[PDB]
Structure 1
Amino acid sequence: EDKIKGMFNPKIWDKTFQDGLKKEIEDSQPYNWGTIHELVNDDLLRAVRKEIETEIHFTKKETDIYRVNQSGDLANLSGLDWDDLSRLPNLFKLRQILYSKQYRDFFGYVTKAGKLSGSKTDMSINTYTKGCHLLTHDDVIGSRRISFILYLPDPDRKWKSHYGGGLRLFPSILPNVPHSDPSAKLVPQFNQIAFFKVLPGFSFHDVEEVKVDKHRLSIQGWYHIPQVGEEGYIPGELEDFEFPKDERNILSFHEVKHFEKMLKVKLSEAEFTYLSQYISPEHLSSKGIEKLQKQFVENSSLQIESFLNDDKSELLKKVIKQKELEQECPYHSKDVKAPWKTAIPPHKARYLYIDGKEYRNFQTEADILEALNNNDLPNFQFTKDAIKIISDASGNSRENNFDAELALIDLAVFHKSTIFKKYLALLTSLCPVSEQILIRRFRPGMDFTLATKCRFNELLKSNPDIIDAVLEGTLCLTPSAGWESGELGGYELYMMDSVLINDPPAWNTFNLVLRDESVLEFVKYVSWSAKSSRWDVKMKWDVKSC
């Protein structure tokens, strides 16, 4: 058609504009990308927005990595059928011009992408409303070659930075290892397009949570590698960088023999006394133990309420609330200080944790390689010792004290005790043979994990006595309200590869799950709107049957 070029801003046909844009994309950071303002005929795009509002039904969908209002799921009668746009003539026209030979020649030229398919049209229409988000990903799927997003928020009002919903780009520490924190954030406006060549290991981006009751509407899509022969196209013409590691340390022979001897309520008065320092009387009585045992036999899981006793519940709630209220939480990995670490990389997870290992702050490749050449083991008492020194020098003020960290480490030490593992073996009739304990904090608007399976200990795979499962515990210490609906996120989700557990954050609960090879788990992204972080203690053990 003669009219296709005239449906765009005439600047994109100007050689001088094209060459300048090609150079800007070439020299962009943190990987090659670009943006064009006022792309399309304003009346056309306005007409498209009206059609969308009028004709398209959006359906909220939530997974580990996103919450979005989609229109594309053809498992909904509601699902948008791109083969039938009878009532969206202007949308039909928009797709036609974006995949035109004319536009593709311009666009492939400035992005240095090579040939682009005109027939492989690939678009979807979505809105992000309050709490909606999409976490870090690189778009690498199939024949996708260039990613684009055309923004259609209200054309007569400015989208503002504090609304959220920014497009964020993440720089590379090394290939397939994006930095945890983004280095650029685009605030989208009507008739702006953002785009980038899809680059395995590099083109990491996300959609910042929408923080207000506004509708962030977009059309997002891809240009693909052409079909074979299309316009003459001829084909052909990392676990190491994850922290913390999903690894456990084997227990001493002293411990393991204790558990065996017991399994072949046999705890002593002194052991019950020790347990009663932390655990509520309810769960140490003969009746309570029997109930928990029966529950674990039937479900291969426990969900305990009011796990810790009142003394320790009161202490931990106090110091955690004080820290929430009176201290400045770091919101960039560079600002995080001992004893905390940031989980990396961000296309897998982001949260703060205490593991008892020497301090690490991963800003460069050198930082990571140094850790990989010098593996060290957890030691929580040394971590405590280190905190005291830091703490004395500064002065232990309301603003800088480590009261929460010290109380939490004391709790970790309890769960590390031989006697606690004996109680665990009693509840489960399983013998722990390894352990990993982590204290975790999931900050509002930053932190999450994605759905993953347990990681078997490879060295133990051939041991017949060791169960093909990982026993996993979670002690939640989240003192704030408003979580019950799941709307603020932070819920612990266990599901089969159908949901086994879906528990929003709560105060003083203990979940215990025997995971076989296929069970998936994650902690959902915590909304910016949450009233505190999710705080918990995570425990994992290899087990043998005795």
Structure 2
Amino acid sequence: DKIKGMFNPKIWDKTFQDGLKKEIEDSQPYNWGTIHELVNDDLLRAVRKEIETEIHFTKKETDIYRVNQSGDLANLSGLDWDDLSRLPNLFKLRQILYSKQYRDFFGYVTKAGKLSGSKTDMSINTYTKGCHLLTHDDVIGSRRISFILYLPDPDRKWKSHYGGGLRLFPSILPNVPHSDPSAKLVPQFNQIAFFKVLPGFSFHDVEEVKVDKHRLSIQGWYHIPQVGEEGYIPGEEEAWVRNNTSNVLEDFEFPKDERNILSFHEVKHFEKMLKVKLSEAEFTYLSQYISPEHLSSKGIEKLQKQFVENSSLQIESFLNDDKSELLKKVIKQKELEQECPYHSKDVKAPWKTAIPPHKARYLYIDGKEYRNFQTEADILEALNNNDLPNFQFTKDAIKIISDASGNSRENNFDAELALIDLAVFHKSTIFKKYLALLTSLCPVSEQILIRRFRPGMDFTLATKCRFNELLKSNPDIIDAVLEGTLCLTPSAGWESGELGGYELYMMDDSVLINDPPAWNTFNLVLRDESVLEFVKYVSWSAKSSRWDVKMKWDVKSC
């Protein structure tokens, strides 16, 4: 048997097979398996060499990933699955993996039943330093089992600190993965990792590659049997796709994309002004935080003109010298002298973790009562007991925790307190008057968040604004959300190192803004329904978190 002989002879042994089936049954957080030294060593070495000589990889980055790919439609990479003339060993590899012999073995140990021999579905990718793939479940089309065969250097050990681990996530509920993974597989040459595709459950990701090494892999899927194949059931595939394609789940997303309506006093002030002038006292108040260049008569005129022309502002050195210096000092001190929580269970007041991880992950201060979501019950409690932001109470709580601890260089809340003070400034009636002056728009609601995006952990994905549905019938209220981001990231290397963390606004060139983290910048965007936004995953190589203050307002023409 020329097929059987191209695999490790152990895989044809009944005792081995039963042992592996048991391993898979007993695995966590959902059923998965691995086999070491799977394929004939000479064959797999020859495949690696063919790939190196015949395939050219191209970096592709999206919100969800950065991966060096070879699957371009025109086959300019050199990989054409319809014509493997220059890769005969790869041809042999695909043939043996989709053989009846292997499929019968593989379907048995995974309890997946019959698998398609003809619907071959493989991809060849490399992950180099900074490459990653964020949380997802693989539930697409007729996929039945996911597999990844790893081909890093056969004569060197791939090490845990290299990154590139396959990580698997437990679930709080179906389609609601826990923020932190519970298993990690470190890939080696000729090792295969695999799992039955599980709608709602099979959440996994590829840990960023943290060093200058090349993680080469062949990712594939076994599919539901097709017409004329063993195990084919007419209608099975159609039913599977339908049941996986066909908004209760938004309840499990935190923070909520919700704004609170402003006071009668506030709205009157904005209306009165826009039906042109700030008092000297009001300018004095603004000058406590904002640079003089953005408060001068001609500075304001320029900003007003820019907003009219672009429906956005990108302001540099937004905060004045005093506040910029204060914030830089306290943020740098926290970055360099304090320990950051790197698991949601370890996050303490005033911080929360954005969830679920197939949508976002980051730390935030919202001014609401402390939440740490580890169980379904924790989430249900929050939903039954909505509370509203209160930044002064949050400040108060911080002082009491701090005074109990001693307020040292290791545990002080100087950064959080300074950032909350900044949030309170932006919550002030006078700030919103200034915002109204710049935009000729009348804020009627607000949400303010302080965010920290940790290296190797944090990101958001491309999403649209959420309109205040109670305000939809109001003809004065514009069909848009005004969104501000005050970036306070003190480290460098973001652009040159491609460290992620950039704020991206695009139309659904479609890119409106692509802004790597910087220090003391203020972005303002009037978002209509279609505009997409995200903050890119922050690389482990970043020398600080991305820190910012995120602000959102419903607005009326005034």
TM-score by length of 2: 0.96
What secondary structure sits across from 1:467 in the alignment?
strand
**Could you tell me which residue of structure 1 aligns to residue 245 of structure 2?**
none
Contact kept? 2:359, 2:460, Cα under 8 Å: yes
Does the alignment pair 1:301 with 2:312? yes
- Distance in 2 (alpha carbons) for counterparts of 1:50 and 1:4: 21
Contact kept? 1:442, 1:533, Cα under 8 Å: yes
- By how many angstroms is 1:230 displaced? 2.3
- Distance in 2 (alpha carbons) for counterparts of 1:513 and 1:448: 20
- Distance in 1 (alpha carbons) for counterparts of 2:231 and 2:68: 38
**Closer, same or farther in 2 for the Cα pair 1:123/1:416, shift >3 Å?**
same
**Closer, same or farther in 2 for the Cα pair 1:79/1:340, shift >3 Å?**
farther
What secondary structure sits across from 1:157 in the alignment?
coil
- By how many angstroms is 1:70 displaced? 0.4
- By how many angstroms is 1:81 displaced? 1.2
Contact kept? 2:114, 2:231, Cα under 8 Å: no
**Closer, same or farther in 2 for the Cα pair 1:75/1:402, shift >3 Å?**
farther
- Distance in 1 (alpha carbons) for counterparts of 2:351 and 2:459: 16
Deviations 1:310-362 (A, max 9, x none): 01001000000110111011111111110000111111111110000000111
Deviations 1:375-405 (A, max 9, x none): 1110000000000110111011000000000
**Closer, same or farther in 2 for the Cα pair 1:300/1:385, shift >3 Å?**
same
**Could you tell me which residue of structure 1 aligns to residue 264 of structure 2?**
253
Structure 2: state its 5+ residue gaps.
236-248
Contact kept? 1:486, 1:504, Cα under 8 Å: no
**Closer, same or farther in 2 for the Cα pair 1:252/1:149, shift >3 Å?**
same
- Distance in 1 (alpha carbons) for counterparts of 2:368 and 2:452: 17
- By how many angstroms is 1:483 displaced? 1.3
- By how many angstroms is 1:75 displaced? 4.9
**Could you tell me which residue of structure 2 aligns to residue 436 of structure 1?**
447
- By how many angstroms is 1:265 displaced? 3.7
Contact kept? 1:73, 1:79, Cα under 8 Å: no
Contact kept? 1:355, 1:439, Cα under 8 Å: yes
**Could you tell me which residue of structure 2 aligns to residue 55 of structure 1?**
54
What secondary structure sits across from 1:232 in the alignment?
coil
- Distance in 2 (alpha carbons) for counterparts of 1:58 and 1:484: 22
Contact kept? 1:166, 1:186, Cα under 8 Å: yes
Contact kept? 1:74, 1:81, Cα under 8 Å: no
Deviations 1:268-320 (A, max 9, x none): 11111111110011001110111000000000000000000001001000000
**Could you tell me which residue of structure 1 aligns to residue 250 of structure 2?**
239
Contact kept? 2:132, 2:206, Cα under 8 Å: yes
Contact kept? 2:159, 2:186, Cα under 8 Å: yes
What secondary structure sits across from 1:231 in the alignment?
coil
- Distance in 2 (alpha carbons) for counterparts of 1:168 and 1:477: 31
- By how many angstroms is 1:228 displaced? 3.3
- Distance in 1 (alpha carbons) for counterparts of 2:360 and 2:304: 33
**Closer, same or farther in 2 for the Cα pair 1:139/1:232, shift >3 Å?**
closer
- Distance in 2 (alpha carbons) for counterparts of 1:72 and 1:55: 13
Contact kept? 1:113, 1:197, Cα under 8 Å: yes
**Could you tell me which residue of structure 2 aligns to residue 505 of structure 1?**
517
What secondary structure sits across from 2:145 in the alignment?
strand
Contact kept? 1:336, 1:342, Cα under 8 Å: yes
Deviations 1:216-273 (A, max 9, x none): 000001011121342251145x110001011111111221121111111411111111
2:283 to 272, 278, 293: 272
- By how many angstroms is 1:79 displaced? 5.6
- By how many angstroms is 1:52 displaced? 0.3
**Could you tell me which residue of structure 2 aligns to residue 532 of structure 1?**
544
- Distance in 1 (alpha carbons) for counterparts of 2:26 and 2:480: 49
- By how many angstroms is 1:492 displaced? 0.4
- By how many angstroms is 1:505 displaced? 0.5
- By how many angstroms is 1:486 displaced? 6.4
- Distance in 1 (alpha carbons) for counterparts of 2:219 and 2:226: 21
**Closer, same or farther in 2 for the Cα pair 1:24/1:232, shift >3 Å?**
closer
What secondary structure sits across from 2:477 in the alignment?
coil
- Distance in 1 (alpha carbons) for counterparts of 2:441 and 2:222: 54
Deviations 1:430-484 (A, max 9, x none): 1111110000000111111111111111111222111111110000000111113
Contact kept? 2:127, 2:216, Cα under 8 Å: yes
Instruction: Name which of structure 1's ranges 68-77 and 423-432 shifts more when overlaid on structure 2.
Output: 68-77
Q: How does 1:124-163 map to 2 (within 5 A)?
A: 124-163=123-162
Contact kept? 2:289, 2:319, Cα under 8 Å: yes
Contact kept? 2:146, 2:194, Cα under 8 Å: yes
Deviations 1:19-57 (A, max 9, x none): 121121112100011101111111110110000001000
- Distance in 1 (alpha carbons) for counterparts of 2:464 and 2:451: 19
- Distance in 1 (alpha carbons) for counterparts of 2:491 and 2:451: 16
**How many residues are aligned here?**
544
- By how many angstroms is 1:77 displaced? 2.4
What secondary structure sits across from 1:230 in the alignment?
coil
**Closer, same or farther in 2 for the Cα pair 1:30/1:232, shift >3 Å?**
closer
- By how many angstroms is 1:80 displaced? 2.1
2:468 to 457, 478, 500: 457
What secondary structure sits across from 1:468 in the alignment?
strand
Contact kept? 2:146, 2:221, Cα under 8 Å: yes
- Distance in 1 (alpha carbons) for counterparts of 2:522 and 2:164: 35
Contact kept? 1:72, 1:79, Cα under 8 Å: no
- Distance in 1 (alpha carbons) for counterparts of 2:115 and 2:164: 29
Instruction: Name which of structure 1's ranges 495-504 and 361-370 shifts more when overlaid on structure 2.
Output: 495-504
- Distance in 2 (alpha carbons) for counterparts of 1:214 and 1:220: 19
Percentage of pairs with the same residue: 100
What secondary structure sits across from 1:291 in the alignment?
helix
- By how many angstroms is 1:160 displaced? 0.4
**Closer, same or farther in 2 for the Cα pair 1:274/1:344, shift >3 Å?**
same
- By how many angstroms is 1:76 displaced? 6.1
**Could you tell me which residue of structure 1 aligns to residue 374 of structure 2?**
363
